[PDB]
Design a protein around this ligand. Sequence first.
Ligand SMILES: CN(CCOc1ccc(C[C@@H]2SC(=O)NC2=O)cc1)c1ccccn1
Length: 271
Amino acid sequence: SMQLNPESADLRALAKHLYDSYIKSFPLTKAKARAILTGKTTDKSPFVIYDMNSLMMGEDKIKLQEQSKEVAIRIFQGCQFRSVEAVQEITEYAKSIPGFVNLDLNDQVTLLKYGVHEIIYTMLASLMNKDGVLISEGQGFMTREFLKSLRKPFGDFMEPKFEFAVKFNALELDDSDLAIFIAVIILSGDRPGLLNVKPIEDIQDNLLQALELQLKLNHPESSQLFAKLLQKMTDLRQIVTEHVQLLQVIKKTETDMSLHPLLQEIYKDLY
Ligand SMILES: CN(CCOc1ccc(C[C@@H]2SC(=O)NC2=O)cc1)c1ccccn1
């Protein structure tokens, strides 16, 4: 039913704008990650962390009393620091979404508070294959089974993210698709405590039309892909819920556990 009209031309311009700002905001794109993971890159191989020995060499190779801490806690704290960096990137990307910076600044903050973890887990899939995940902007690669070997209660925190990634990656989205997918998530009008829902819904409705057109153009091999991505949005909310519960369980049994204060603020009323 697709047409070349002014409306479709505007949706393509919006897709391109979003792609261009995504490239500016996120230094390690899915294209560059896939090239590293396949070896197809001309870059030096990342340092592979597959066991305790290679974890410690990695800490020398990859460029106070935190180092004192046990391996599992140094890794968990590394993931938290990654997430704080990602929040900065996603914030800069959100400001590029047309209409976002004209929303009420409280609503901008609310959308980022409730959206950032869904986007973090989306983009973490770009850096994953069935064996492991890229770390330190592609300088390292940490194996799935090494992460599973960490002592309880830290042996299971990456497993749901890998499970998500294997299925998400089978959809073969590229960075032009992901730019629009992430924008749609950020512009969710059902986040708690939003002042002005209708202007958020208006922006999301337009992004959703831009996403459906992008997917029909870019993926002739599937007519199901738009529907499947709507389901992945709901799946991501359950991944974040499942992570919040895991942090509850970690905290009871590991009460010495330092959570980054920025993440403590984001997690406050996050369910
Ligand atoms: C496994 N990797 C890749 C990043 O993997 C991540 C896993 C989980 C998160 C979410 C964090 S962890 C938490 O409790 N809250 C958060 O926001 C963010 C990144 C490592 C491992 C060590 C050092 C750096 N990278």
